[PDB]
Amino acid sequence: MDIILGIRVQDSVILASSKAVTRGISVLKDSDDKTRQLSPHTLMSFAGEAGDTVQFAEYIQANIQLYSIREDYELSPQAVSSFVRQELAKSIRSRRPYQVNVLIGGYDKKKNKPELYQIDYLGTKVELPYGAHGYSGFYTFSLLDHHYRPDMTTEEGLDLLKLCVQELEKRMPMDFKGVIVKIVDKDGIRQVDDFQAQ
């Protein structure tokens, strides 16, 4: 082990998530989408224990979608992340905790700013210019500490991400089968389906 990275540029948040699903000695799948859209301007990626992962994401998805319809309104990224943190904080002391770590990337319309939150299974939340869960951060935080600028464009961010994915392919012991990359800005969430050989 599941790569989950995030970088916040000037006008968007970019999420990249590995495609592999591995059980034991077999890669069962190489196109896994470790993502749920929570609302048209908020995306969540996740990694952790086998079943908990999707169950948690979908449960969160159901809850935010419920709010949207009740209020005919879209919760801010900050609100969704607080909501998510609290669910994890409760879970950590329950009978069987959710073992899931998440990235939340959102575009806030009230402020017109991208926002990236990193939350681990304990309910530790932080807002970051860039983040990662698992081992991948052991490579990417230092790379980005060097190459990252606050005023990068979306295309600059995608280059910076290409650099991170290169580093991981070179140094990480596991084959994670490339990533799926998603951009979240004012015009919503879109997938860059060309990254495998871009």
Partner: protein, 120 residues
């Protein structure tokens, strides 16, 4: 708690409390729906007893249950909110378990079941 029966049968075979419930609907503002060839339209009348209202924030009578289904009513306004909430919950739950939004018939069967339950 308190579960003393209030809705029971009349000598001639009606459930009085349900019948009087229909009376509350009769005195509620009017609502109408008609279906086109490729659409459906919902119409409602707003009362004239008080006219210094703020329309921005006053709950309107048509409600989204999901992004593809709507609900309007006639009768006790506060009563309708309990139904709209449960229907919204059910609709998310159905997307969660069956991986598909509800059919309009499904959602109706569901609301109707809630209503029926509250008669017995």
């Amino acid at each position: 708690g308190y579960d003393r029966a209030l809705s029971i049968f009349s000598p001639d075979g009606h459930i009085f409390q349900v019948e009087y419930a229909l009376e509350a609907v009769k005195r509620g503002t009017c609502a109408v729906g008609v279906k086109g060839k490729n659409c459906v339209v919902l119409g409602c009348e707003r009362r004239s007893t008080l006219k210094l209202q703020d329309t921005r924030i006053t709950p309107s009578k048509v409600s989204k249950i999901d992004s593809h289904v709507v609900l309007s009513f006639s009768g006790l306004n506060a009563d309708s909110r309990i139904l709209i909430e449960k229907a919204r919950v059910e609709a998310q739950s159905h997307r969660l378990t069956l991986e598909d939004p509800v059919t309009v018939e499904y959602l109706t069967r569901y609301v109707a079941g809630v209503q029926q339950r509250y008669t017995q």
